[PDB]
């Protein structure tokens, strides 16, 4: 808690620069003056004040920056936000979990051309980081699924790589056709 107050002391002292000069914003700003508000407040109930709680704070925070606080990474996007976030639904539902990726299909689709798309991170010419990938029927409507689960261990480019073929390999067997992007066929 005195910590916690010694943490946001330091961090607003930085955050000050990017308006104090530049575009800024009249939230962002105002954020600011909110930030440095509820500085005073929470000091005066505190009985400690800025000055002494931001320089407590560059060791609190400044000691924390190690590792090194840091492999040009980047990010690769079929999907806009809207097909990402869209909801579906499985008439004939299959699920499983695989490591840390969840992966969905509908068993009642057949005959379809089927088509994935994928949003996420690459690293040299493979994939790093799945954000989200979707199987979408040529009318568009969404018939697959492979999204990562928050865990500890994460993914890597192999899991998701191994998820893929599982996904086509399922689909495939009511005599889909599936394809996957550009983006897909180059990186995983």
């Given at each position: 808690?005195?910590?916690?107050?010694?943490?946001?002391?330091?961090?607003?002292?930085?955050?000050?620069?990017?308006?104090?000069?530049?575009?800024?914003?009249?939230?962002?700003?105002?954020?600011?003056?909110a930030d440095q508000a509820s500085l005073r407040g929470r000091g005066n109930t505190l009985g400690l004040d800025i000055?002494?709680?931001?320089?407590?704070?560059?060791?609190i925070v400044e000691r924390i920056l190690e590792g090194e606080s840091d492999p040009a990474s980047r990010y690769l996007t079929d999907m806009t936000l809207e097909e990402?976030?869209?909801?579906?639904?499985?008439?004939?539902?299959?699920?499983?979990?695989?490591?840390?990726?969840?992966?969905?299909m509908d068993q009642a689709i057949m005959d379809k051309t089927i088509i994935l798309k994928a949003n996420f991170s690459v690293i040299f010419d493979?994939?790093?980081?799945?954000?989200?990938?979707?199987?979408?029927?040529?009318?568009?409507?969404?018939?697959?699924?492979?999204?990562?689960?928050?865990?500890?261990?994460?993914?890597?480019?192999?899991?998701?790589?191994?998820?893929?073929?599982?996904?086509?390999?399922?689909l495939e067997w009511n005599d889909n056709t599936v394809r996957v992007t550009e983006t897909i066929q180059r990186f995983a």
């Open positions: 808690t005195v910590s916690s107050f010694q943490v946001d002391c330091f961090l607003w002292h930085v955050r000050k620069r990017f308006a104090d000069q530049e575009l800024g914003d009249a939230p962002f700003l105002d954020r600011l003056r000055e002494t709680a931001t320089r407590a704070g560059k060791q990402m976030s869209r909801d579906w639904f499985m008439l004939m539902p299959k699920q499983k979990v695989a490591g840390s990726l969840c992966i969905k493979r994939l790093e980081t799945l954000i989200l990938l979707r199987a979408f029927t040529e009318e568009g409507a969404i018939v697959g699924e492979i999204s990562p689960l928050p865990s500890l261990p994460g993914h890597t480019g192999e899991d998701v790589k191994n998820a893929i073929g599982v996904l086509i390999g399922g």
